[PDB]
């Protein structure tokens, strides 16, 4: 029954600003102390900052790496929690998620969370892929080879071999975001050794938002 | 980090098992634990010293010994697998809370499978293109938790390193990649380029080379 849902989340570019909201019922938003925590993709949660109640002295306390770039401020007449992003990093990329936080010297306990809102931090527009082979050569009768999907924006990318005639084997891995904002994944397919002579493997980016598709065959060096 | 996890741990169906976070704030305040599913948002687990929200079942423990906290599951079910989270205070008398790693827990569903390992030195093209990416492809694995390692000439190195969180594959098992970005003359420069994998605490090495 306590319900949090937070919003605002979007693409925007290093140094400049989001607002997000986090939207409440099902407890006296009015006596809870409330919390942000955002987790990078793949990675862990980490503490952004928290707001105490207005009876407690409605004050705010950050985690080092956003203090003095976030501000969490909340309306209780809307039942609405607040984190006003600037100064904005690539390394703010995350799911930032809010919580209604249990307090009892004392440490304070994140009782309920939202589903999350995702915020992604990039100066990078549109770019297409530049696509890479990951050759065999000299695993007993098998071999891997495969294809590297470089620096490309926005996401998503997709991959198939041989048109989709060709399945067993073969795994997409998620797209790494590097610090140039631009994304990065492989694609491999595990294929028997003596094939490679007679089959020929081609991996097929599509690349939608560029329009742009590669075909790239993969050959032993 | 002030609060630290082992990375992942497994449980047969039934057993009993433990996770525990460890840090010098843990001294003063007791550790909250946090449970999250793949794709799903956290639940708190306990808080306080072994208080359960309602809905958390009682097979679900906390305890606490000197800087040390501990997530205790008796009788695992297959919906406790799960990452899991701790958190406290960052130090005693801060304002601030901090979590944990987090800890992979598997709760055991299918054999336990050592990673097939490959690395791909950076390909020709991509040198001309005036870049050069090694490619760990780490698959076929389970459970689903890896650490990766990267050597320079024996040595290990460990900047412009990233590693995507392992994901299921069609058959069910677990994969990751893992990069290493050079320059081509960092490349060219050195005698070796090696990729560590440590899985279920055994380690594998695939090495690779400038020449040949």
């Known amino acids: 029954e306590v319900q949090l849902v937070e919003s605002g989340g979007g693409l925007v570019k290093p140094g400049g600003s989001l607002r997000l909201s986090c939207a409440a019922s099902?407890?006296?938003?009015?006596?809870?102390?409330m919390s942000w925590v955002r987790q990078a993709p793949g990675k862990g949660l980490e503490w952004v900052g928290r707001?105490?109640?207005?009876?407690?002295?409605?004050?705010?306390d950050y985690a080092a790496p956003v203090k003095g770039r976030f501000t969490i401020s909340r309306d209780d007449s809307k039942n609405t929690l607040y984190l006003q992003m600037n100064s904005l990093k690539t390394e703010d990329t995350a799911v930032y998620y809010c919580?209604?936080?249990?307090?009892?010297?004392?440490?304070?306990?994140?009782?309920?969370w939202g589903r999350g809102t995702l915020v992604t931090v990039s100066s990078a527009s549109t770019k297409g892929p530049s696509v890479f082979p990951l050759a065999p050569s000299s695993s007993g009768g098998t071999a891997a080879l495969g294809c590297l999907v470089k620096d490309y924006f926005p996401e998503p990318v997709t991959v198939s071999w041989n048109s989709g005639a060709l399945t067993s084997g073969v795994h997409t891995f998620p797209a790494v975001l590097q610090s140039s904002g631009l994304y990065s994944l492989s694609s491999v397919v595990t294929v028997p050794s003596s094939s490679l002579g007679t089959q020929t493997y081609i991996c097929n980016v599509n690349h939608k938002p560029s329009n742009t598709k590669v075909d790239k065959r993969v050959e032993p060096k | 980090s002030e609060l630290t996890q082992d990375p992942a741990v497994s449980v047969a169906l039934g057993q009993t098992v433990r996770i525990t976070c460890q840090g010098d704030?843990?001294?003063?305040?007791?550790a909250s634990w946090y449970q999250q599913k793949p794709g799903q948002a956290p639940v708190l687990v306990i808080y306080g010293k072994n208080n359960r929200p309602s809905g958390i079942p009682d097979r679900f423990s906390g305890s606490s010994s000197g800087n040390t906290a501990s997530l205790t599951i008796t009788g695992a079910q297959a919906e406790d697998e799960a990452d899991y989270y701790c958190?406290?205070?960052?130090?005693?008398?801060?304002?601030?809370?901090?979590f944990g790693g987090g800890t992979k827990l598997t709760v055991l569903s299918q054999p336990k499978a050592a990673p097939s390992v490959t690395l791909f030195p950076p390909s020709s093209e991509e040198l001309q293109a005036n870049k050069a990416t090694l490619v760990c492809l780490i698959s076929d694995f389970y459970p689903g938790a890896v650490t990766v390692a990267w050597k320079a000439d024996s040595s290990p190195v460990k900047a412009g390193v990233e590693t995507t969180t392992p994901s299921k594959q069609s058959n069910n098992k677990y994969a990751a990649s893992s990069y290493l970005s050079l320059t081509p003359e960092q490349w060219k420069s050195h005698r070796s380029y090696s990729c560590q994998v440590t899985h279920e605490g055994s380690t594998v090495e695939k090495t690779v080379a400038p020449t040949e």
């Open positions: 919580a209604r936080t249990g307090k009892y010297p004392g440490e304070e306990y994140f009782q309920d």
């Open positions: 958190s406290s205070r960052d130090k005693s008398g801060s304002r601030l809370s901090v």
């Open positions: 707001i105490k109640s207005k009876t407690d002295g409605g004050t705010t």
């Open positions: 704030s843990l001294r003063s305040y007791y």
């Open positions: 099902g407890f006296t938003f009015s006596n809870a102390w």
